[PDB]
Amino acid sequence: IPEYVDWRQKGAVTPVKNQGSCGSCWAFSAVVTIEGIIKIRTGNLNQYSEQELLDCDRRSYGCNGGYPWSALQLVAQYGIHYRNTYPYEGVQRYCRSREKGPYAAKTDGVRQVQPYNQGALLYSIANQPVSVVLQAAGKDFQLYRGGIFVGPCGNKVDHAVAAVGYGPNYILIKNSWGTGWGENGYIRIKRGTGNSYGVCGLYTSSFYPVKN
Numbered sequence: 286i287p288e289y290v291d292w293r294q295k296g297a298v299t300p301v302k303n304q305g306s307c308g309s310c311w312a313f314s315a316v317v318t319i320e321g322i323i324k325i326r327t328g329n330l331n332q333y334s335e336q337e338l339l340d341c342d343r344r345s346y347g348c349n350g351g352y353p354w355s356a357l358q359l360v361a362q363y364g365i366h367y368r369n370t371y372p373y374e375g376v377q378r379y380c381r382s383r384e385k386g387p388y389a390a391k392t393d394g395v396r397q398v399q400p401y402n403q404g405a406l407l408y409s410i411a412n413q414p415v416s417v418v419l420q421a422a423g424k425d426f427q428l429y430r431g432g433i434f435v436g437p438c439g440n441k442v443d444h445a446v447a448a449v450g451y452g453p454n455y456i457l458i459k460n461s462w463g464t465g466w467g468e469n470g471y472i473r474i475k476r477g478t479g480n481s482y483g484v485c486g487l488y489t490s491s492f493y494p495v496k497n
Contacts, residue, residue, distance in 0.1 A: 286411035291450035301470030303463030307348035314445035315356035321414035332368035347377030364388025438485035
């Protein structure tokens with residue numbers, strides 16, 4: 286696998302989004318992996334709807350938090366609409382998928398990468414964007430403006446984001462707090478420290494969609 290991987294350079298990452306006050310990061314995280322696997326398999330780059338996952342995933346708790354893997358399973362059991370046809374409102378509403386007509390994409394399943402193993406995560410990122418979790422409650426993560434993030438932070442994971450690349454000393458992360466945070470909405474987090482948990486708990490639970 287390469288020394289550097291960056292899926293934005295390969296045309297598989299859409300613009301950075303802002304979730305607002307709503308704790309919908311789980312939906313935002315699932316969507317960037319869907320957007321990425323569709324580009325890799327069909328060559329078409331499209332934006333998909335986080336709002337549809339916020340309203341229709343009833344294993345999650347809307348704006349109070351939820352699960353990246355249930356949103357991904359939902360897209361494999363049913364499908365998802367374009368972002369354009371089901372735009373983001375920032376509040377959980379009624380599941381309006383039937384009213385929006387035919388689904389725009391549907392996946393063949395979801396897989397988990399082997400937890401607490403840096404090599405497993407690098408090998409999946411070199412194949413597609415992956416949904417990852419980390420601890421973001423710390424003041425250091427919140428006030429990050431740029432550079433390689435070394436912490437400090439513990440392992441109490443609370444936020445879902447998407448890994449879209451890596452380099453010799455970092456993993457490239459797309460976050461959903463808009464462009465006014467970090468490196469235009471991205472963070473580069475330190476890798477290669479021998480710590481199995483990952484800095485800020487990055488190797489705790491990682492998932493990706495399958496499309497044949």
